[PDB]
Every structure is written in C-alpha cells, then in structure tokens.
Amino acid sequence: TVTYTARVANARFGGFSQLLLLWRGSIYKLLWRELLCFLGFYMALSAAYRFVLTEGQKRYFEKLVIYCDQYASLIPVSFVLGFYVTLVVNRWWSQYLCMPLPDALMCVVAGTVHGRDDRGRLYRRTLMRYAGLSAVLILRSVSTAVFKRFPTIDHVVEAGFMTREERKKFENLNSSYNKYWVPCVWFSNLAAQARREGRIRDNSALKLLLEELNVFRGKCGMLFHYDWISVPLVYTQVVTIALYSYFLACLIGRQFLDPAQGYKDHDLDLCVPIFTLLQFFFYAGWLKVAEQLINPFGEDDDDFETNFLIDRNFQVSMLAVDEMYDDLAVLEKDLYWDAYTFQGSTF
Amino acid sequence: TVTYTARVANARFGGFSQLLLLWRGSIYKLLWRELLCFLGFYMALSAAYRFVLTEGQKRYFEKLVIYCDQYASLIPVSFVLGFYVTLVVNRWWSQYLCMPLPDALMCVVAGTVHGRDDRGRLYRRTLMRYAGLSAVLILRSVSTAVFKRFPTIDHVVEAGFMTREERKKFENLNSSYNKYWVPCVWFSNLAAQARREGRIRDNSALKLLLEELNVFRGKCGMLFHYDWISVPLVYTQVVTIALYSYFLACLIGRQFLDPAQGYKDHDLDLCVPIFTLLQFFFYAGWLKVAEQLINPFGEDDDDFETNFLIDRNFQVSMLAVDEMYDDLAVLEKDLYWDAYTFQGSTF
Amino acid sequence: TVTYTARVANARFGGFSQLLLLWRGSIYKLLWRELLCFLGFYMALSAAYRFVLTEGQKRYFEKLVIYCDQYASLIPVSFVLGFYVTLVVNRWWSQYLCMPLPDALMCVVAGTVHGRDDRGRLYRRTLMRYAGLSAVLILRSVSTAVFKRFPTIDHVVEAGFMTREERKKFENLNSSYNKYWVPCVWFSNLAAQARREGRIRDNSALKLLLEELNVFRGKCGMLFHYDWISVPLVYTQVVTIALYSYFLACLIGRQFLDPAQGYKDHDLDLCVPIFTLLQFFFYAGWLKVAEQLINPFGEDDDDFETNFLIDRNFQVSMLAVDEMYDDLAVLEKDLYWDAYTFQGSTF
Amino acid sequence: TVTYTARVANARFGGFSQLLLLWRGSIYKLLWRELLCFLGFYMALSAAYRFVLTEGQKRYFEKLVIYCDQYASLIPVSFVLGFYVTLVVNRWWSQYLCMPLPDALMCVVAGTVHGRDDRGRLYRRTLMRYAGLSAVLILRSVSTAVFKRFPTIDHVVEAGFMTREERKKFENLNSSYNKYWVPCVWFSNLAAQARREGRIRDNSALKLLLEELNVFRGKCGMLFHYDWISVPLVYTQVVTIALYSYFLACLIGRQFLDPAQGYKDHDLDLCVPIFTLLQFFFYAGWLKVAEQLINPFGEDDDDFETNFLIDRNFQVSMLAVDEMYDDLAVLEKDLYWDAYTFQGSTF
Amino acid sequence: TVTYTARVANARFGGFSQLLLLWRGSIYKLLWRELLCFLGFYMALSAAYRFVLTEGQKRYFEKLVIYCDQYASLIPVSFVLGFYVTLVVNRWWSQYLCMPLPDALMCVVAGTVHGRDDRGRLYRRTLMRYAGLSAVLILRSVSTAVFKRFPTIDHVVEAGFMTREERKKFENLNSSYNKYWVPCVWFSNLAAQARREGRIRDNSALKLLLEELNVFRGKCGMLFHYDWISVPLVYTQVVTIALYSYFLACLIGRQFLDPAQGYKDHDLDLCVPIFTLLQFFFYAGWLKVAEQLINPFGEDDDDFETNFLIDRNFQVSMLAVDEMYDDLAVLEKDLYWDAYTFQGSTF
Numbered sequence A, B, C, D, E: 001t002v003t004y005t006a007r008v009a010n011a012r013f014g015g016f017s018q019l020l021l022l023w024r025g026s027i028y029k030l031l032w033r034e035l036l037c038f039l040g041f042y043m044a045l046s047a048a049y050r051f052v053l054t055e056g057q058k059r060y061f062e063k064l065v066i067y068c069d070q071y072a073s074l075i076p077v078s079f080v081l082g083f084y085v086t087l088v089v090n091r092w093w094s095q096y097l098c099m100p101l102p103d104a105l106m107c108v109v110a111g112t113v114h115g116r117d118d119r120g121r122l123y124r125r126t127l128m129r130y131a132g133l134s135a136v137l138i139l140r141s142v143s144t145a146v147f148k149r150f151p152t153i154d155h156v157v158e159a160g161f162m163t164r165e166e167r168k169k170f171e172n173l174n175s176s177y178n179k180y181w182v183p184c185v186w187f188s189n190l191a192a193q194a195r196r197e198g199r200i201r202d203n204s205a206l207k208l209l210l211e212e213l214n215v216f217r218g219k220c221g222m223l224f225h226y227d228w229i230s231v232p233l234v235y236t237q238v239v240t241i242a243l244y245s246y247f248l249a250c251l252i253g254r255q256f257l258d259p260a261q262g263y264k265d266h267d268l269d270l271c272v273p274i275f276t277l278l279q280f281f282f283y284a285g286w287l288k289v290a291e292q293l294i295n296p297f298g299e300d301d302d303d304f305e306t307n308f309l310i311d312r313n314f315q316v317s318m319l320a321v322d323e324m325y326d327d328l329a330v331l332e333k334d335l336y337w338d339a340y341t342f343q344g345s346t347f
C-alpha cells in the first residue's frame, strides 16, 4: 500500500501535480517497459517505412495505414475496458473489506472472558490466537506474500500461531479441503468450555462471542471465495485482446506518412507519435492498474500489506486481551464534571 | 470455475498475455463456432459479389453496401449490451453469494449442541445433514449439474443426505411446491427438541442456532428466487436481436468493394474483414459471456462447482461437528507468553 | 413471470437464438402494435411525398427531411433513456425482494410455539395466518391482480385469511390509512399471550419471533412505500417526450428521398426504412420494458405471480406449522456414521 | 408526492402517453417559465439579426453563429449532468428511506409494554409519542413544510407532541445543538423505568425495545446528516454553469441564418428552433428534476408528504399501542383447519 | 461543510442561479488560480504567434495547431475522469458515514448504566468519554484539522478527553501501532465492571452495550482503513496526467490562427478562447472537486467539520448521560388521550 492521504488533505494550487514525482506505486513503474516496447515496435515500423520499402511498397503501406486508422475505432476498447475496470475496482475494495480483524473479537474477549490468573490469560490469549491463526491460514492460502512468509505449516508453528499439539490435531484431520475453518471450530469449542467453567459469566456473553467469531470466520470465508471465484477469465481475455488489437492497429495507422503525397490529415511529420503514446499510456495504464488490483494480495507496491496486518493484529490482540485486561484507571472525575489551538435548513 | 488468481498476483511485464493461451473457460472455446459461421456467411457474400453478380447487380450491391455501412450504426448495440451485461454480472455475483454454506451453522452446532456420547453425535450430525439436505434440494432444483447427479429423491437417499424414513415423511407431505424448506423445519424442530432435552444448555444458544438456520434458509430461498425470477425475457430478446441485426448489417456493409469504382473509403481490398471480425469477436464475446453467466449453475467451464461445493460442505460439516467436537489441544502457553522469511496521515 | 433459466443453463451454440421464438412475455407481444403504428405513419408520409406533393412541395419536403435528419440527434434519447431504465430495473428488483415471505417466521413458529394439542395448533396457525393476512392486505393495496382476486375485505374473509370476528375488529378500528399493519399488531399481541401462557418457553424465543415479525412487517411496509413513492413523474414524462419527439423527427428525416435529386446519402431508395424500424424497435422496446417493470404487480406476462405466491405462502406456512410440527423422523445414524452419476492460489 | 403507480400497472398500448396530460408534479409545471425565457432571448436575438444588424454586422454575426455552433459541444453538459443527476437521485431515495416510522417500535411496544390499566396506557402512549416527537423535531429541523406547520416549539406543544412539563425540560437543557435526540433519551429512560416497574416482563424485551429505538434514532440522525451534508456546492455550481453556458452558446449558434448566403447546413429557415427547444427542454428538465429532488422536504409537488406522514404515524402508533393492545379476537379455527375471481429450472 | 439545503428546498424559477454568487466552498475559489495560469500560458503562446514568429514559423505553428486540435481528442479525459470522480464521491460519502457518533451509545448508557449517585454519574460519563476519546484519537490520526487542534496527547489530556492516569496507561502500553482502539478496550472492561457491580442490571443490557461499542469501534476502524488505503496512486497519477496533457494539447490547438490563411474552421479570431476556457473550467473543476473530496478531513471549505462534530458529540453525550439520566417528566395524559398552520394504487 502506497499512502498519500496527508499530501491531499487540502485542495492546494499544485494539488495533484506533486504526486506525479512519486515512483513507488506509480504508473511509470508499472508501465515504462510496456511503453518502451510499444515505442520500439512503432519506430521499427517507421524506420522500415522510411528506409526500406520501395515507392510502390510505400504507397501500399500508406493505403494500409489510412484504413487501419479509420476502422481501428471499431474495437470497443473503452466500453469493455470500463466495464472490466469497474468490476475489478469493486472487487478490490470488497476484498480489502473482507480481511479479518480481531478488534471486535478482542474487545468482546477482554470484556467477557474473565480471570486475572494464568488460566484466564490462557483462555483469552488462546481465543485471540485461534482467530489470528484462522486469518493466517486463509491469508497464506490466498496471499503470495504471506505464503512466502509461511511456506509450510511448520513456519506457522514456529511463528507462535500454532502449537505442536495443535499442529498434530490439524494434520490428523482427514480433510482434502482448506482447513482455515479449523481454528474457528477450536474457538467455538474453547468458548463453550470457558462458559461451562464459569470464565464467561452469562449465556448472552457466549452468544456475543459466537456472533463475533462468526463475523470473523465469514470474513475469512469471503477471502477464500474471492480467491477461488476469479473475475471470469473470458472478460480478462477479451479485455487483453481488445487492448492488444487496438494498439496493433494504432501501431500501423498512427504512422506518419510522407507529407509530399498530399494525404488528408498527413501534413505534419512529428516522427514520434505523442497522442498515440499518450493514448497508449492512458489505456494500457488503465489495464495495468486492473492487473495490479485484480489480485490485491500479491507483492505489487500498491497491494495490501498482509504481513504488516498480520503482525499488527497479533500484537494488538495480545495486548488488548492480556495486558489491558482489567487494567482500568481508577474512576476519576473529568474536566467538565461540574460544568482549539448548525441546527437545520429551516432554521 | 476456472481459477487464475495466482497467475495474476503481481502485475508482471507480460501480465495478462500469458492468460491468452488458456483454452478451458476461454473466449475462444465459447465463440469459435460463432466466429466461424460469421466468417462463412461473409465469404459466401464476398464470393457471390466477386464471381456471380453482373456489373449492374454489382453496382446495386455496392450502393446497398455503402448504405448498410452508414446506418448500421443506428442499432444501439453498445447501450443495450452494456446495460444487459452489467445486470447479468451483478446477478451472477449475487447468486454466487446466495449459495448456502454450513460454516456458520457448523461452528454454532459444535459450540452449542453438546454430548460426547452417541446421542450428541446424532444430534450434531443430523442438524448438519438437514442443512446439507436443504442445500442439495435447492441446488438440484436450480442446478442442472446437481440434478444430473441427483435425478431423483432416491439418489438423494442413496447419497446419505436423506434417510428412508425421512424420505417417507418428505413424500407424504401434501404440497405442490418445492419442498427444499422441509429440512429447515426439521432443523428447527430438532433444535427445539435438543434444547428441551438439555443438549443445548441455554435459550440464547437456541436463538443463535435459529438465527444461523434462518440465514442458511434465506440463502436457499434466494437461490430459488434467482432461479425463478429470470432476467426479463424482453431484455434477452432485445439484446439478441440487436446483436444479430447489427452483425447482419455488418455482413453487408463490411464488404470490400472493387476499388476501381472509386468509392470513398474503399481503396484497399483486404479480402478478410479484420476489424469487423474483431468487432464481432468483442461484441459477440460480451454477449456469450452474458449467456454463460446468466445461469451460473449449468455445466459451462466457468460455471459454479456446485457438486464440489456440496461434497466439500458435507465433509467439512461432518468433520467439524463430529470429529472436532470437544477435541481441543490442552491449553498451552504460546510463544509470546512472556514477551519473516503506519499510524495516520497527520502523523 | 416468464421463466427461461433452464434453457440458458449452458452457453450453447444457438444459445439465445432459441429464445427469439417465444411469444409470452416477449418484446414482440409488447411492441408489435407500436411498431405497426410507427410504420403506418411513415408509409403515410412516404405515400404523400411520392404521390401527392408537387415538385416545389417535394423540394421543400426534402429540405425539411435533411434538416430533421441532422438535428434529430440533439434529442438526448440514449442518456435519459439509460438513466430511466437503470432506475426502473433497480426498483424492480428491490420491489421483488420486498415481497414478504413466511419461511423465516414459519421456521421460528415451528421451533418456538409449542403444543401438540388443539391450542398449540391454533396458536401456530393463527400466527402464520396473521402474517399471511398482512401480506394479502398490502398486496391487494399495491397489486391490481390481487385486488381483482380480493376486491373487498369480504373476499378476504371468505378466503380464510380473516375471520368474521377479526373482520369486525378490523372494520371497527378508527383509521383513515391502510390497515395492513393491523395483523402485525395482532401477531405481536398473540405472541405475547403465547409467551405468557407458556406456549413459548423462553424470552429469547419471543424476541426472535418479534424480530422475524418486524422483518416481515418491514417488507410489507417497503411494498407500501414503493407503491406510494412512484418514480418521479417528471422523469416518466421527460423520457416519454424524448422518445416521441425523436421518433417523430425520425418519421420525417428517415424518409427516402428521390435519388434523382442527387442529395448526398440518398442514392438507394429501399422504400421500407429498416434501420429506423430497428432503431425504433430497440429504443421503444427499452421504454416498453421500463413500462412493464415500472409496476411489477400488474397483470403483464412478466409481472410477479402475486396470487401464486399468496397461495404458495399460505399452503407452505400451514404445512410447516401444523403438519410438520414435532413430526421428526427418529434420530437414525446416517450413511457416513463410521466413515456422482481447490485450496488456494498460492498452493 | 404525485402517485401514478396504478395507471402504469400494465404496459398498455398508450402506456406512458396518458401521463403526458398531467399538470401537477409535471415537467411543464417546473419548466414552462424557463422555456419561455429561453425562447424569448432567442427570438430577441433573431429579431435583432433580422431587422437591426446591417449587412456587415449580419455577416459577422453569421460567422460568430457558425463558430458557437461547432464548439458549444466542448461544454461537457451530458457528462457532468449525468453524474450530478445520478448522485441526486441516489440521495433522494436514501433520504426517503431515512424517514423514521414507528411501525416496528409500535409493534414492539404493543407486544412488550403491558397493562390494561391507565398506567400501561400512559407508558405505551408516552413511548410512541416520544418517538413521534423525535421525528417531528428532526423534520421541522430539515423540512420547510413541517417548520411552517410547527414554526415554534409552542406549536409542537399545542399539537400534543410535547407537554408543558416536557417543554420546560426541553428548554432548560443547556445545549447549543439540535435537540431532536432528547426524546430518544427520554424513551430510553422510560423504557428502563417500565422494565424496573415490571411493565416490561423480561430483559430481552427491553433489549428489543432499545434496539428498535436505536434504529428509529439512527433514521432521525441520518435525516439530520443528509440535511447538513448537502451535495457539494462545487458540483451544483459546475452543473448550473455548464447548463447556462451551453444554452447561451446554443442561443447564438442555433440561430437560423439567411439561406441566401449559401452557408452549409443553413438552407431551411424554420424561424422557431424546435430541436434546440427540445434539447433545452430535456437538459433543463433533467437539471430542474435534480433541483426538485435535491431537497425532497420542501414544498414541491413531488416532494415528500412529511406532514401527512407525521399525522399518519401519530394516529397509527396511538391506535396500535392504545386501542389494539390486548384486543385480539378469540382464537378461532380457520377455514382450512381440517383441509380466485413452479419448482425449478432442472425440473 | 458549506450548507445550502434550505435555499434549494423548492425548485423555484431562479433555483440554482442564486447559488452561483456564493464564494465560500465554491468552484471559483478552488479554480481561479488554475484558470488564470491556463489563460496566461495561452495568451503567452498567442502573443508569441502574433508578434514573434516569422511567416514560415507561423505556417509551421499553424500546421502544428491543426494537428494538436484533431488528435488531442485521443486523450480519454472523460472516461478516466468519470471513473475517478465516481470512485472519489462514493468514498467521500462512505467516509462521512464512517465518522463515529455516540448517540446510540449514549441512549444505551442512559437506559442501562444506573445510579443517581456520584458513582453512576462517573460510570456513565467515563463510558461516554472513552467513546469520545477513541473518536478523537482516530480523528487526529486521520484529520489534519483535528491534529492541529490536538498536536500531542498532552493536548488531549488538557481537553478533558484523557486523564493523567489514563495518559500514563496509554503511553506505557508497548505498541508500535495506532492506539485508538485502547479506549474501546477500556470501555469493554468498564462495562464488564459495571455489570459485575450491579450498575448494569442484566446480561442483555451488557450485550447491547458491547454491540453498540463494537459498532462505534468499527466506525473508527473504518475511518482508519479509509485513511490508510488511499485511492490507488496509479489512478490519481493517470487522471492528473490526462488532464494536464489534454489541456496542453488544447493550449496549442485552441489557438486562433490568422483567418487570412483560409484554414477551414478558422474564420473568426475571438482572441480569448471561451469554449476552451469553459471546457477547462468544467474538466479542471471536476478534477479539483475530486481533489477536495479525496481527503474530506483536511481544511477545505467543503471538508467535514470534524472539530465541530467532536465538540457537539462530547457535549451531547455528557448531557444525555449525566443531566438527562432518570430525569423524565411525570407521566401525563397527552392531548388525544380520550380522542396545520393514500391507501394504494388498486384503490
């Protein structure tokens, strides 16, 4: 994730201009190779047309250029591209919102699972760790960066997310499908045991715990579903073919013909085709942003910080349910006990 | 479902190009026959115009070609097609999200329905199987693949989803409508009986069970409603007629006329009309993807894996509520008990 | 409702072509009269221009035709039409989703309202019938077909939805507004009485009953709000005027002028204007589908089957809460007690 | 609100044509003055060009007309207008859905707050009246019509919504912000008191009451937020300037020039510019509908019936919680105790 | 926030015209500098072309102008700009809806945390202050204005949001991530303590408190996520580059060439290019509104009133939970105890 929210807090005079200088997570970083290749094939064609083809070959190439120029517009680049990009962006935001977080569960566990002794500490820490382990399992299933960090379940064990006994239970389970849900069932069983033992003092607290756990597990399952149900490959292939075919047609009809032939719209020979290069920049950049966002769990600069989120969630959950449990400051009267650096339209 | 999420994890140099080689779940597989037929009727027309029609017939055909070329654009292909495809894609994703899953119910049942003896096992397994049977009944009602797998209720009985006594109760029910809801009523009655018998220890647990069951049954009912309330047939007919009429008009006005006649925009005779074939490819591919996604429960390559989901859900639910019930690893201190391979914009 | 989901289960070679033959719920059925009238006024104008007007009148009519042809495009038909159709389709789906269904309530009542005797039967049946009666009252308020089926409250009484005593209570209520909510208040009072009498064994069950009843009543109220708050009449008038004015301008400028005058773009006299008739077909069909969907509770072929839904809901609710109450099959071990005809991208 | 849902129940032959005759809540009523002014300035310009300007001035005006005609299209009227209208319509529907209604609260209060004596009547009536008073306070804050009906809190007191003692408590509260939330806090305190006194028999009932009250108060707060957070004034100014500038450019380039000068596209002098007047009608009508819907609580014909809703809500809530409390008809066997005027695609 | 809802309550004759005069939160205020710079570079180019370039240089500049005029349209300004603006506006409204408010929590605390003595006052005030402190911490993390108001945690302490002991606990927590969640864990612990001590009389009340607290904390976390996950920088860079490149191309091809050369479409030399300046106004205004809304927590005129909201929330929460606790007016019969200044379409 490349963050620039603070730089755009106010609409200043040079508001978005100062963001053009950034390289990390930039359009240039994602598209400079493609732009260079496009310019290379254009100049190769230009050099051929200028210093290779004969007069008759030149005339035929000019006729072909003028045709490819007037019909290359039959390729519905904008229509398919816009549909595809909108779909990808909606999926991108939904996928980010589907990443599990323990904050709700950690608050519920701090307020519901009781005991200052070692057993209560164990209960709270184990519940938070079960949630974190479900998150880690799903993320390594769906995230290339997380999988590179946890290439095996042994890595998960060595990171403190899974114990050795828990690893034995996890492996001995006879299932051919992803087992990310297993820690959620462990969480449900442990919450039931805590309620039975009296650590959870009321049935409503257990129901709230189970509801929050179901929300968390549903987020993990949504992550799994988004990973499994990709954007239909037909749309990806169609958009890629549309971009490639349109830019090939532009490579031929964006050629600058000899002005001496008197062709209409061919009087100025700039040599380098700026507007095609700008048009290629914009359209190929749209497609490249779609490629980056299509799987937001890879290792792109603007992809999600899944490992950072894992570490933050684990640390914060442990802090909240272990160190800050029953550790309030004595009730003290606030500043305004005795009391800077709109009502309505009709009023 | 054809999955390619891992191949697109990072926006690489040849990012989407490597996906053009796939055949299964591809645009080529869905559209090669239609493209071949379109090219066949175009060349038939071209051969007729070239070697059959007389000079006067050729002149008249050229006039007709130039007219069909300048007005074929009055057919609002893009407008209707975009509206239709957006509607279909939204329905496709909603329908996928409407497929019932037992994960929430299985977690609740593992944490709420108690007993290590055979009776508790029976309760948990029967509840999970009632949920799975509701899912199977609705899916065979709405999915052609599932129906082919379960052509009769006897097949459902032989798969272990329904017992013989349950089959007798199911058939003896005097109803002329789909009975997918019957297992949900069985689930409610069995949950009430378990609560009465003490297997469910508190009323809040029963309420949570009923809420999760209602979520599951609502997903099944949404599947039924999506199956029943098709996309309005008027839109389907209009889009199909628009595509057919536009491509017939293109079959006549995309003809390459004899350049010797001096018609404007007719100087290069390529023989094969690439841009029309590319335009046909893109628009007909849009429509074909809409056809594939309109019923995502068929047997298209990119359709949902309903049978795989059925098997996975059954296996996972049985595992969670039978083998992993009250089977936790003893509470063990984690790695960080005593403690790799952003704060805000204003900060 | 015209259903064709099964015919489109797989994207076959002639996928959507086989749907063009359907008449019921078709574009032809909705638009053939309008198309015939449009063609009639066009040919009347054509016959006048061909065999009535003099040479000078013909020249003036040709000038008028060429003007109406180049400016008729200033009417933003596509823009307003697309906005209107999107609004109408979104409202159509939301309205369908707002139709109350007793499935959730029937499951809750089967699992919560107890008693195998006649009193428990009466409680369950009366609650389900109160829900059904609220649905019927709202539907006859908003649905022309339902009102034709229940033109008076006496018809509701004779259908078994309302009793005579309930009819007296309903009529004696001093209210000038729609009373569809009255059965919901009756349901709340009856649920409270059942809880007090012990038929509902716990307060959580009563809370769940009330929550489901509130969901049902909210769906009925949403139906009422959709019926009351129509799509703004300004948009309807604007879209209708846009279509009418554009097609009148086309009736004059889509005329085929005498080719002997040498007007540009007027060399081929087809007599029947196909592309205008196709353009009229598509745009007027869009508008006609909007008209059909604007009130989905009328008696159009593709409108909702409100009466079928009423009958199905009543029958299913009665079955679930009367015949299937406490009528489970004895707990039997399933097939797989002792155990056909993906994990992640990073894996 | 102008309702025409019944007139459009079925897609008849003259479906939307019969709605063009309506005046109330019509496009003509909202736009006839603007159309008259536009036509007045056009004819003033036409009369000047025809009978005032000299030959040289006429030639210069013709050159200016032909320029303003070919570039007036650089003003992105459709783009900004469509974005703005979509935003406004979405906000319009959301605002309507944000209007509080007591139906859920009234059902909960009828089923949960008990007592046939005067004290129970007082409790139920006071709770319903607190909800209604919160609605009234927010509406008079945000609705010009409601404020005209309740220009002062004394008017609220005299309407029976607030008592004199409640008015003293309301005024003595030291707050500089809108106090619409005060009746919600009164409702919470009164519900707590009723639960303590035994009128509410269980804690779950109190929780349900508080949840419904929070839903109601959230709707009131959403009304307040929509009133406060207007559509960004930048968008309003931009759209207004775009419409004004485009129609001024049309006022100059939609002029009909003397055909004797031989200007291309200027052969027919109609005098009155129909297509510009139709284009002005459509675009200015779009903008005027946006103006009407931007604040749906004013006194436009199609604005919400806030006062009618206030009266209906108060009357219905009082009826439900006072007259229909514990007033059920004796449980009677229905018509079908002993038992008119689809299953699935795969089946 | 600039509010104009009351001025647009009714669609008056000069409805939106009277809003063009506003300066604060206006398009002029945001765009006058950019418009002045654009006009400056255009006139510099115009003066160069008029009084510097020679005849041959003038001819070459005219050829370059006519090219940049016909191809500057290959830059997809509208497409990318519309996508970007829609994304930004959706995020803007979602971010506003994500701002935490204590109204629900304050109602729950008033109705659930009991005691007229000093201890109950302390409990209620401390809970409301914990919610307010979480809001303040998140806002100063994400809002530049709030951070300027609270540049350090010492400022938070001196504002009464945090006590000195609470500050010590907050700082002693070993965490490298944003601690806005810490007051939420304090709230959960304090609610648990209040329930244990008997201030909260039932477990359902505690569950409701925890649910409302989780809603509040989720809103704060959504604020954090929106601040962190900016709109992808690739889209920002692409839109900025598109606008800059299009307007540079317009700066060259919007030049007015010498009419004596007989270039087509160059007969009238206005000197100042109005339509380009209007087109620049509209497109750059779209982009500038996007810049303003991209971070709605800055100090733009139309940005959110975060400090006002903080003050209002604190004051209202304190009032509701301290002064209005158990301070109802005695139950009094209303005006209509003994009883101004639609039913359905089928009816």
Ligand SMILES: Nc1ccc(C(=O)O)cc1
Pocket (backbone or CB within 6 Å): A253, A254, A255, A256, A257, A265, A266, A272, A273, A274, A275, A276, A277, E071
């Ligand atoms: N004929 C041409 C038209 C346009 C361009 C270009 O701007 O790239 C190049 C050549």
Ligand SMILES: Nc1ccc(C(=O)O)cc1
Pocket (backbone or CB within 6 Å): A071, B253, B254, B255, B256, B257, B265, B266, B272, B273, B274, B275, B276, B277
């Ligand atoms: N006249 C023609 C115009 C275009 C095409 C084509 O690209 O297919 C073919 C013929």
Ligand SMILES: Nc1ccc(C(=O)O)cc1
Pocket (backbone or CB within 6 Å): B071, C253, C254, C255, C256, C257, C265, C266, C272, C273, C274, C275, C276, C277
């Ligand atoms: N001049 C005309 C242009 C088009 C049409 C038509 O296709 O209907 C008819 C006449």
Ligand SMILES: Nc1ccc(C(=O)O)cc1
Pocket (backbone or CB within 6 Å): C071, D253, D254, D255, D256, D257, D265, D266, D272, D273, D274, D275, D276, D277
């Ligand atoms: N030159 C003109 C072009 C169009 C119109 C018009 O239709 O209003 C008027 C004049």
Ligand SMILES: Nc1ccc(C(=O)O)cc1
Pocket (backbone or CB within 6 Å): D071, E253, E254, E255, E256, E257, E265, E266, E272, E273, E274, E275, E276, E277
């Ligand atoms: N050739 C030109 C075309 C248009 C404009 C303009 O309206 O700004 C200026 C010059």
Ligand SMILES: [Ca+2]
Pocket (backbone or CB within 6 Å): A291, A292, A293, A294, A295, A296, A297, A298, A299, A300, A303, B008, B009, B010, B011
């Ligand atoms: Ca990626």
Ligand SMILES: [Ca+2]
Pocket (backbone or CB within 6 Å): B291, B292, B293, B294, B295, B296, B297, B298, B299, B300, B303, C008, C009, C010, C011
């Ligand atoms: Ca299909």
Ligand SMILES: [Ca+2]
Pocket (backbone or CB within 6 Å): C291, C292, C293, C294, C295, C296, C297, C298, C299, C300, C303, D008, D009, D010, D011
């Ligand atoms: Ca209809």
Ligand SMILES: [Ca+2]
Pocket (backbone or CB within 6 Å): D291, D292, D293, D294, D295, D296, D297, D298, D299, D300, D303, E008, E009, E010, E011
């Ligand atoms: Ca208004």
Ligand SMILES: [Ca+2]
Pocket (backbone or CB within 6 Å): A008, A009, A010, A011, E291, E292, E293, E294, E295, E296, E297, E298, E299, E300, E303
């Ligand atoms: Ca800003």
Ligand SMILES: [Cl-]
Pocket (backbone or CB within 6 Å): none
């Ligand atoms: Cl609950």
